[PDB]
Amino acid sequence: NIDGYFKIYSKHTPINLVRDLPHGFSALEPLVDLPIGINITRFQTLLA
């Protein structure tokens, strides 16, 4: 969130590894921008 514009960059995998996060380079492409204008101070992710 930057001067009233929220920004998102993201990526998804080729990897089927043992357990922990691989060290490795794939950058996140930009995907969306939203003029939300709010103070975000905190957050929470949503599960199934």
Binding site: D3, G4, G37, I38, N39
Partner: protein, 49 residues
């Protein structure tokens, strides 16, 4: 817009913010109506001295 927005007694629907603890940032919108501390007291209810 006097020709449109004014009323002979005064168009008292038009509101602005008069008191704040700090400034707001570039392009911020503050929707709040909580009672302002100019008094040092932990001020609560619809007023305070």
């Amino acid at each position: 817009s006097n020709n449109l927005d004014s009323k002979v007694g005064g168009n008292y629907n038009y509101r602005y913010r008069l008191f704040r603890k700090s400034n707001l940032k570039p392009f911020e919108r503050d929707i709040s109506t909580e009672i302002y501390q100019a008094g040092s007291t932990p001020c609560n209810g619809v007023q305070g001295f």
